[PDB]
Write an enzyme that holds these catalytic residues in place. Structure first.
Site, PDB file in Angstrom:
ATOM      1  N   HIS A 132     -24.595 -47.751  30.308  1.00 60.59           N
ATOM      2  CA  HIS A 132     -23.547 -46.687  30.676  1.00 60.59           C
ATOM      3  C   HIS A 132     -25.024 -47.001  31.833  1.00 60.59           C
ATOM      4  CE1 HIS A 132     -21.950 -45.135  26.424  1.00 60.59           C
ATOM      5  NE2 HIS A 132     -21.161 -45.599  27.485  1.00 60.59           N
ATOM      6  N   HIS A 165     -14.063 -49.692  31.823  1.00 59.10           N
ATOM      7  CA  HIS A 165     -15.095 -49.280  30.725  1.00 59.10           C
ATOM      8  C   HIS A 165     -15.548 -50.154  29.767  1.00 59.10           C
ATOM      9  CE1 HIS A 165     -18.443 -46.583  29.920  1.00 59.10           C
ATOM     10  NE2 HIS A 165     -17.805 -46.782  28.295  1.00 59.10           N
ATOM     11  N   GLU A 166     -14.690 -50.031  28.564  1.00 63.84           N
ATOM     12  CA  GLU A 166     -14.668 -51.342  27.686  1.00 63.84           C
ATOM     13  C   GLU A 166     -14.717 -52.814  27.938  1.00 63.84           C
ATOM     14  OE1 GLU A 166     -15.318 -49.546  24.891  1.00 63.84           O
ATOM     15  OE2 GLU A 166     -14.321 -46.743  25.977  1.00 63.84           O
ATOM     16  N   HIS A 179     -18.422 -52.962  29.023  1.00 64.75           N
ATOM     17  CA  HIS A 179     -20.051 -53.397  27.695  1.00 64.75           C
ATOM     18  C   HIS A 179     -19.390 -54.675  27.411  1.00 64.75           C
ATOM     19  CE1 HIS A 179     -21.377 -48.659  27.356  1.00 64.75           C
ATOM     20  NE2 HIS A 179     -20.113 -48.254  26.969  1.00 64.75           N
TER      21      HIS A 179
HETATM   22  C1  724 Z   1     -13.281 -44.329  31.401  1.00 66.21           C
HETATM   23  O1  724 Z   1     -13.703 -44.031  30.083  1.00 66.21           O
HETATM   24  C2  724 Z   1     -14.238 -43.545  29.287  1.00 66.21           C
HETATM   25  C3  724 Z   1     -15.624 -43.542  30.073  1.00 66.21           C
HETATM   26  C4  724 Z   1     -17.227 -43.226  29.544  1.00 66.21           C
HETATM   27  C5  724 Z   1     -16.560 -43.122  28.042  1.00 66.21           C
HETATM   28  N1  724 Z   1     -17.870 -42.777  27.354  1.00 66.21           N
HETATM   29  N2  724 Z   1     -16.706 -42.575  25.854  1.00 66.21           N
HETATM   30  C6  724 Z   1     -17.630 -42.270  24.627  1.00 66.21           C
HETATM   31  C7  724 Z   1     -18.122 -44.080  23.796  1.00 66.21           C
HETATM   32  C8  724 Z   1     -18.733 -44.100  22.935  1.00 66.21           C
HETATM   33  N3  724 Z   1     -16.830 -44.785  24.142  1.00 66.21           N
HETATM   34  C9  724 Z   1     -17.575 -45.497  25.428  1.00 66.21           C
HETATM   35  O2  724 Z   1     -16.919 -46.794  25.068  1.00 66.21           O
HETATM   36  N4  724 Z   1     -18.686 -45.165  25.282  1.00 66.21           N
HETATM   37  C10 724 Z   1     -18.841 -44.171  25.139  1.00 66.21           C
HETATM   38  O3  724 Z   1     -20.247 -43.191  25.028  1.00 66.21           O
HETATM   39  C11 724 Z   1     -15.236 -42.981  25.740  1.00 66.21           C
HETATM   40  O4  724 Z   1     -14.417 -42.866  25.345  1.00 66.21           O
HETATM   41  C12 724 Z   1     -15.412 -42.818  27.269  1.00 66.21           C
HETATM   42  C13 724 Z   1     -14.699 -43.280  28.207  1.00 66.21           C
HETATM   43 ZN    ZN Z   2     -19.515 -46.623  27.075  1.00 66.72          ZN
END
Ligand code: 724
Ligand code: ZN
Length: 255
Positions: A196, A186-187, A190
């Site tokens: 998202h 996920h990171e 980004h």
């Molecule tokens: C599967 O991992 C995930 C998936 C969605 C997530 N959402 N979040 C909060 C936050 C602020 N960090 C991020 O990278 N996206 C966000 O909205 C996780 O920390 C997160 C982690």
């Molecule tokens: Zn995110």
């Protein structure tokens, strides 16, 4: 677009802070590194097997260039902060830093090293507020793959926004490795330019009976549904454009 096998890998500087070393690495370099090597390799399987254009634009992934292991907290002078210092910031009474301030501090402290790699990623062990597990630059509604300078008026130097972080602690316990792999996916997602997955696009946010959500869903996927470990068509479109723009700039040959 045709893949360039000489420019298809985003090389990473992976940093394990003292919290990660102690709590995940059990105070050993071997345990710490084995955890990260295996996690990065599983994340690389998701990326490398993804066809970004749903055809032949695949084979793009990530590999570790260096693992920095911070065995002890960073000694700081009064009023000075460092991502690896013993205390949490801004609140020392809390188990964790404010996540945004931590990502900013890491980027400041790692600037020189970050300028030489596609991405730098911090692995820590701290319980961020409201179930947050990680944070990264890129795919926000700048930063991401390839060091791009940002002059920090506060920091008084250039910092690079080719950074992200993962914590393997949530609600007072170590997260499952299947959960950790998805946080990092996920990171880096980004970092690779994905935003998202929005609810309003059924194609990008399927129902549980349909295989569940994709990795870029804003509510952390658990890993028990088929789609959880994959990128949606929304994420593929965004990442495809980023790779097309960025691979020649900082991607390297797969080792
Ligand atoms: C599967 O991992 C995930 C998936 C969605 C997530 N959402 N979040 C909060 C936050 C602020 N960090 C991020 O990278 N996206 C966000 O909205 C996780 O920390 C997160 C982690
Ligand atoms: Zn995110």
């Amino acid at each position: 677009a045709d893949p360039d096998p000489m420019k298809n890998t985003c090389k990473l500087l992976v940093v394990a802070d003292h919290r990660f070393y102690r709590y995940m690495g059990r105070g050993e370099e071997s345990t710490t590194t084995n955890y990260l090597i295996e996690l990065i390799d599983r994340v690389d399987d998701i990326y490398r097997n993804t066809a970004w254009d749903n055809a032949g634009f695949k084979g793009y992934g990530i590999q570790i260039e260096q693992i920095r292991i911070l065995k002890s907290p960073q000694e700081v002078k009064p009023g000075e902060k460092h991502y690896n210092m013993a205390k949490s910031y801004p609140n020392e009474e809390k188990d964790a830093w404010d996540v945004k301030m931590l990502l900013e501090q890491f980027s400041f402290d790692i600037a020189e090293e970050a300028s030489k790699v596609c991405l730098a990623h911090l692995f820590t062990y701290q319980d961020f507020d409201m179930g947050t597990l990680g944070l990264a630059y890129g795919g926000s509604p700048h930063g991401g793959v390839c060091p791009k300078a940002y002059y920090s008026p506060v920091g008084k130097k250039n910092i690079y926004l080719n950074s992200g972080l993962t914590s393997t602690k949530n609600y007072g316990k170590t997260i499952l490795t299947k959960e950790a792999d998805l946080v990092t996916t996920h990171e880096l997602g980004h970092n690779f330019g994905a935003e998202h997955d929005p609810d309003g696009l059924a194609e990008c946010a399927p129902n549980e009976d349909q295989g569940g959500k994709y990795v870029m869903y804003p509510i952390a996927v658990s890993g028990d549904h088929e789609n959880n470990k994959m990128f949606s068509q929304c994420s593929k479109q965004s990442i495809y454009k980023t790779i097309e723009s960025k691979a020649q700039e900082c991607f390297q040959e797969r080792s």
